[PDB]
Amino acid sequence: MNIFEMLRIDEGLRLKIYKDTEGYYTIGIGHLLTKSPSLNAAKSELDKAIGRNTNGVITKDEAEKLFNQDVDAAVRGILRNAKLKPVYDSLDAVRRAAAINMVFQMGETGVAAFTNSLPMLQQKRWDEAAVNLAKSRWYNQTPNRAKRVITTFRTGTWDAYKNL
């Protein structure tokens, strides 16, 4: 298991434009295109992302290319953020993966709520952090996806992803 396999489990893979859990146009492995309700606007973003005039449809190779870019962007975002970087630096590699997921194409509200749990993570108060995390908006929206990520933070193991 690793961050790529982890997010592949949590996001799935779809090669045609679809709507994510918030109703936003998305493609591939959870690549958010736009928050606009316009499918045309979504298609425009897709073409710009891929570098060709698509039919709202991409290949698996293209989906994986975007995915790698998005994983990179998440790590980049963490390392450039004054609140996230020290917590990330403080974590083991398994828990770092959980952070990458929480940061991966996450809403501003999700990030806001996650920030509140950062103190617990950095102190390595795992059970307390887990409880505090369950209060987050991410958990309310997708209790299952949040439960896996929280279990990863709580245990520092891949146990929540091993049956998957």
From Swiss-Prot:
Look up and give the organism this protein is from: Enterobacteria phage T4
Q: What is the effect of changing S117V?
A: 50-fold decrease in enzymatic activity
Job description of the protein: Endolysin with lysozyme activity that degrades host peptidoglycans and participates with the holin and spanin proteins in the sequential events which lead to the programmed host cell lysis releasing the mature viral particles. Once the holin has permeabilized the host cell membrane, the endolysin can reach the periplasm and break down the peptidoglycan layer.
InterPro entries to which the protein is assigned, alphabetical: Endolysin_T4_type, Glyco_hydro_24, Lysozyme-like_dom_sf, Lysozyme_dom_sf, Phage_lysozyme-like, T4-type_lysozyme
Describe the effect of T26E.
Answer: Complete loss of activity at neutral pH; covalently bound substrate
Q: What is its EC number?
A: 3.2.1.17
Matching CDD domains: T4-like_lys
The protein in question is named: Endolysin
Q: Name one GO cellular component term.
A: host cell cytoplasm
Q: What is the effect of changing D20 to E/Q?
A: Loss of 99% of enzymatic activity
Q: Name one Pfam family in it.
A: Phage_lysozyme
The consequence of N132 to M/F is: 2-fold decrease in enzymatic activity
**Outcome when changing E11 to A/F/H/M/N:** Complete loss of enzymatic activity
Q: Single Gene Ontology BP term?
A: cell wall macromolecule catabolic process
Q: What does the UniProt entry say about where the protein is found?
A: Host cytoplasm
How activity varies with pH? Optimum pH is 7.3.
